[model samples]
Target: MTEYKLVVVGAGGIGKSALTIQLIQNHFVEDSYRKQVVIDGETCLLDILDTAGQEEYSAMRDQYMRTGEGFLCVFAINNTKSFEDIHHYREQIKRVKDSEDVPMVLVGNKCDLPSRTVDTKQAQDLARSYGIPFIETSAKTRQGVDDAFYTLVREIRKHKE
Candidate 1:
C-alpha cells in the first residue's frame, strides 16, 4: 500500500495545527495559537507528522523529519518573525531529508486577519527563491485552505507519476 507522509512544520503559533484540523476534521478554533497536522487520502494513507513549533526540542524534531515525504513550511500573515523563520525551517528539512529536490509549500496562514496585512511582497519573493509552492490561507473564513492543500498533493503526484 503506497502511502504519503505529509510533514507539517513551522515556528510556534503559526497555524499548523489549525490547518490540520480544518483539513482532516473540517474543524476550526478561534484564537487558539497552535500547530496541527494529519494526512488525508483514501488510497494513499497519510502518515501525517505534526511538529511542535517550539525549538527547544531540536533533537526530537530531527527524528520526526525522517518520516516526512513532503514538507509544509507554514507561517502567519500576522507575524513577520514567523514568516522569517521559514528560512530556518526550510534548512532544517533539507538538512534532515537530504533531498534538495524535496517538494515544499510555503504557507502564509491567517488570511482572515488580512487587516493585519502581514503578508508582504518580500516574503513571497523569498519563498520564490526557495522554489517551493506558495499560498495564503484562512482557517477561520475557510478561504483558500482547500486549494492550498490540494495543490500540495498535486505537487506530490507530479513526481509520483
Candidate 2:
C-alpha cells in the first residue's frame, strides 16, 4: 500500500552497504535493494538507494538525493571524522531538496565493536538539533538494522501527514 524512496549515506567507511544489506537481505542486498515488506502491520516497498560515499561518487549522489523520500544518515561510532561528516551530508540533502523539512534518521553503525570514539549522548543531541530520530546499529549482528530503515519509513509517512 506504500512505497519509500530511501537513501543511505555517510562517509566512505561508514558501513552503509552492510547496514543496507542487513536490512534488505538479512545481511545481503541488491542494487537499490528493492524489496516488499511488512512493518507495523502495513505492507510497503523500500527502494533503498545506497551510494558509495566517496569523492569519486559525487557524480551520482545528488540525482538520488533529489528523488529520495527519506534518508538513513549512517556513521561509525568508532570514527569521529565520519560522525562529523554526517552534518555535511545532512546539509547537502537540505540543499538538494531545497527545504528545511525532510524525513531523516541519525544512524550510528558498527556499534558492535568495543572500541569507540563517539558516544550515544552526542549523537542523540545532534539528532535532536536536526529534529530527527537517532538509532544505533551494527550491520555485522543485524542490530538495529531493521529498525533504522523501518523507523525512517515511519518518519516519511509522518512527515507526509
Candidate 3:
C-alpha cells in the first residue's frame, strides 16, 4: 500500500486535535493530540501529523512542511483570526516545498457550534483564490471530517500523477 503524510495546521484551540481524532478514531477529545495511522479506501496508509501551535515549534514547522505530501489548513469557524491565518500556513507550505501547486484543503471546522463568525461563502471564496477545495467540518459531530481528509488524499494522488 502507498503511504501518505498529512500535516494538520492552524492556530491554537482551533480543534485540529479534535478533528484529527474524529477522522482517525471516530471520536472527539477536548485536549491532547497524537499521531495516527489510517488506511484509506484505496489502500493507502496515511500518517497524520497533528502539529503543535506553540511558539517553540515555529522553527520545526518548515521541516513538517517539507515532508508532508498533503496539508489540512484548519481554522475555527467561530474565530475570524484563525481563518485569516490560513493564508500564512498556505504560503509557508509553498515556500518550504518550493512549489505553489502543493496539495491542500481549507478546513473550516467547529460547525457544530451555535455561533459562526465565518460564513461558508467567504471561506469558499478564499479557497477559490488558492485553487483548492473548501470543506466545513464539525469535529464534535463528526460531520464532513472524513470528507476533508479523503479529499486531501485524492488531491495528493492526483498531483502525483
Candidate 4:
C-alpha cells in the first residue's frame, strides 16, 4: 500500500492532538500521538506526524517539514495568537521544502467552544492567499473533522498527479 506522510502543526493546546485522535480513533482524547490510518476508498496509509508547538521543538518541527508530503496547519478559533502562528508554520514549511506550492490545509479547530476570536472569513482569506483549503473543525462534536483530513489526502494525491 502507498504511504503518505502528513504533519499537523499548531500552537500547543490548539486541539491538534484532539483532532488527530478524533480523526484516527473516531473519538476525542486528552493526549494523542503519531499513527497511520487507512482512508476509506483508498488503498493507502496516512502516516501522520503530530507536532508540538513548544519553542524547544523548533528543530524537530523543521525535520517534520522537510519530510512531510502534506500538512494540516491548525489553530484555535478562540485564540488570536494561535491563528497568527499559522503564517509562521506555513513559511517554515516552505523554507524547509523549498517550494511555495505545497500541499497543505488551514484548519480552525475548537469551533465548539465559545469566546471566538478568529473569524471564518479571515481564515478563508488567509488560506486563499496561501492557495490552500480552509476548514473549521470541532473535536468535541466531531464536526468537519473527517473532511479536514480527507481534504489533505485528496490534495496530496492531486499534487502527485
Q: If scored against the real structure, what TM-score would every candidate get?
A: 0.81, 0.92, 0.89, 0.88
State residue 64's C-alpha deviation in candidate 3, in Å.
Answer: 1.9
Of the candidates shown, which would achieve the greatest lDDT relative to the real structure?
Answer: 2
lDDT of 2 by residue, 1-161 (tens): 78898988788877987887787678533346798999888999998875743333564667768879998888999999999999999999999888898899999999999989999999999999999999999999988888899999999989999
lDDT of 4 by residue, 52-129 (tens): 533447686576568889989999999999999998888888898899888999999989988899999999999999
Off by over 4 Å in 4: 30-40, 52-58
In the range 19-75, model 1's lDDT, one tens digit per residue, is: 877876777983222323342543445455555533437776686776677777888
Model 3 CA lDDT for position 111 = 94
Q: Candidate 3: worst 10 consecutive residues by lDDT?
A: 30-39
Q: Which model, 2 or 3, shows the larger lDDT? A: 2
lDDT of 1 at 130: 81
Model 3: lDDT equals 0.84
Residue 77 of candidate 1: its Cα lDDT? Answer: 89
Cα lDDT of model 3 by residue, 46-161, tens digit: 77765653343756767756878999999999999999899888888899899989999999999989899999999999999999999999999998988998899889988999
Cα-based lDDT at residue 78, candidate 3: 97
* Candidate No. with top TM-score: 2
Clashing pairs in 4: none
lDDT assessment of candidate 2? 0.86
